Amino acid sequence: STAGKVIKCKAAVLWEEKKPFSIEEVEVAPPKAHEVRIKMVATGICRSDDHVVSGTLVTPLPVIAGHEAAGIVESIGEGVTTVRPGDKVIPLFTPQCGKCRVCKHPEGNFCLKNDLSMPRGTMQDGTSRFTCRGKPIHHFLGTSTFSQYTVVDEISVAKIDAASPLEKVCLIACGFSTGYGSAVKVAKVTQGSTCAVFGLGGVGLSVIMGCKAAGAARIIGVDINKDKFAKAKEVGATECVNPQDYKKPIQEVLTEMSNGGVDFSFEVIGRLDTMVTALSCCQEAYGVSVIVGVPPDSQNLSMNPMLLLSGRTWKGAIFGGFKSKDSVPKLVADFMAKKFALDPLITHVLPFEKINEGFDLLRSGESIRTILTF
């Protein structure tokens, strides 16, 4: 009945930086060839969504943000083969076109169709499916999950288990998979190792979960908000440190604590200074440091390349290094089989209409993940 028709629905439109979202009617065009229109069920609030508001992340405005979500297919465009109406699906903010050199590479996941490197805020065809007040509205990362209905390219959606609890597994769409993969896949954390995790939000807690799953003997959480330490310990941190407690720089503190540097460190904040501090605190000859946090737009860090010459490895990743369409259904299956927990990341639940309250909770420091229900 809605197939092939424009849908009027509520979305959270961001008209301007540093402003509340406006919950208002939008028009959602039907899907074109190899497009999928989804009725959203649940979306998380990730700090990257907040980066759009703050201008830390630059993407064209006005926009419908949101990238951490799950929903139910309303309709498919011509030529779609991988989902059907009524399927539970996760929009993939990192696409998997399956055809580019990255998709073909055994270790690549940052598909060349992404809209992250140089955001256009469109569908793959360079156009928008969203109208508000008669004006075209940008997409975000090909997902735009802050809407009762979105339209995504086929390469940006994965079918997931029909018995999935969508209010939980939406976290597999970003924060859990990112943090857990950054530990298990990107860093390849080893049994008995010492890890340091900078930033104890949803993503950093997910890194801790991955380090614990990998067998790390010591997992040191690092946050300037000590209110984050209890949850970090619950999911596997062996100890937590607040840089503000120490006269010396925290890289020196962590080097002392680890008797000469940690095996694996993770930047899970988004600061240039903590990206360098995290590199420095891993052991100089064999340490590995993984950048997870999103840096501020167009800003360069400064570092001494002797940190690398001695033997350190420095790397970053999007989405925990997971090939998105292959991995999201497997992660959902593994969650169904209790191979990892998502509840420790969910601190608050709100209706979608209380999105601004959700962002207030993240900005105050209170929440980890707020899950919004449509």
Ligand X SMILES: NC(=O)c1ccc[n+]([C@@H]2O[C@H](COP(=O)([O-])OP(=O)([O-])OC[C@H]3O[C@@H](n4cnc5c(N)[nH+]cnc54)[C@H](O)[C@@H]3O)[C@@H](O)[C@H]2O)c1
Ligand Y SMILES: OCc1c(F)c(F)c(F)c(F)c1F
Interface with ligand Y includes 48 (CB under 6 A)? yes
Least separation in angstroms between residue 25's CB and Zn ion is: 26
Owner of token pair 């919950």: 23
What is the sign, positive or negative, of the torsion defined by CA atoms of 52, 58, 63, 69? negative
What burial class does residue 94 get, using C-beta atoms within 10 Å of its C-beta: 0-12 exposed, 13-18 middle, 19+ buried? Answer: buried
Binding flags for ligand X, 198-237, as an x/- string (CB under 6 A): xxxxxxx-----------------xxxx--x---------
Does 111 carry a binding-site annotation? yes
Residues 48/3, Cβ–Cβ less than 8 Å? no
Cα of 209 vs its chain's centroid, Å: 15
132: closest CA among 220, 12, 297? Answer: 12
Binding flags for a copy of itself, 83-122, as an x/- string (CB under 8 A): ------------------xx--x-xxxx-x---xx-----
* Identified binder of ligand X from the candidate list 137, 253, 294, 361, rule CB under 6 A: 294
State the Cα–Cα distance between residues 131 and 121, nearest whole angstrom.
13
Determine the interface stretch with ligand X among 35-43, 153-161, 262-270, 349-357 (rule: CB under 6 A): 262-270
Interface with ligand Y includes 318 (CB under 6 A)? yes
Does 204 carry a binding-site annotation? yes
Interface with ligand Y includes 67 (CB under 6 A)? yes
Q: How far is CA 300 from CA 116, 201, 208, 221, 303, in A?
A: 18, 24, 27, 26, 10
Binding flags for ligand X, 168-187, as an x/- string (CB under 6 A): ------xx--x---------
Tokens linked to 263: 């095996």
Whether residue 46 lies in the annotated active site: yes
* Identified binder of Zn ion from the candidate list 9, 23, 72, 97, rule CB under 5 A: 97
What is the sign, positive or negative, of the torsion defined by CA atoms of 180, 181, 182, 186? positive
Which CB sits closer to ligand Y, 75 or 289? 289
- In this structure, are strands 346-351 and 369-373 parallel, antiparallel, or unpaired? parallel
Whether residue 348 lies in the annotated active site: no
Before 62, cis peptide (omega within 30)? yes
Interface with ligand Y includes 322 (CB under 6 A)? no
State the Cα–Cα distance between residues 173 and 327, nearest whole angstrom.
10
Cα of 162 vs its chain's centroid, Å: 23
What is the sign, positive or negative, of the torsion defined by CA atoms of 154, 156, 158, 164? negative
216: closest CA among 168, 173, 183? Answer: 183
Which CB sits closer to a copy of itself, 134 or 192? 192
* Identified binder of ligand Y from the candidate list 12, 13, 116, 216, rule CB under 6 A: 116
Q: What is the DSSP letter of 215?
A: T
Which CB sits closer to a copy of itself, 145 or 193? 193
Could you say which of 138, 156, 174, 289 is catalytic? Answer: 174
Contacts (CB under 6 A) with ligand Y, residues 219-278? none
Write out the H or E segment, with its range, that includes residue 36. strand 35-44
Which CB sits closer to a copy of itself, 89 or 141? 141
Whether residue 51 lies in the annotated active site: yes
Contacts (CB under 5 A) with Zn ion, residues 139-178? 174
Q: Strand ranges (DSSP E) for 238-299?
A: 239-241, 264-267, 288-291
Among ligand Y, a copy of itself, ligand X, none, the one that 230 touches (CB under a kind-dependent 5 to 8 A) is none
Instruction: Say whether 73 sits in a helix, a strand or coil.
Output: strand
Tokens linked to 136: 């075209």
Q: Note the residue count of the chain.
A: 374
Whether residue 67 lies in the annotated active site: yes
Binding flags for Zn ion, 101-140, as an x/- string (CB under 5 A): --x-------x-----------------------------
Interface with Zn ion includes 48 (CB under 5 A)? yes
Phi then psi for residue 4, to 5 deg, are 80, 0
Which residues contribute to the site for a copy of itself (CB under 8 A)? Answer: 101-102, 105, 107-110, 112, 116-117, 259-260, 272, 275, 283-286, 291-292, 294-295, 298-306, 308-318, 321
Report, as residue numbers or ranges, the catalytic residues.
46, 48, 51, 67, 174
Which residues contribute to the site for ligand X (CB under 6 A)? Answer: 46-48, 51, 174-175, 178, 198-204, 222-225, 228, 243, 268-271, 274, 292-294, 309, 318-319
Which residues contribute to the site for Zn ion (CB under 5 A)? Answer: 46, 48, 97, 100, 103, 111, 174
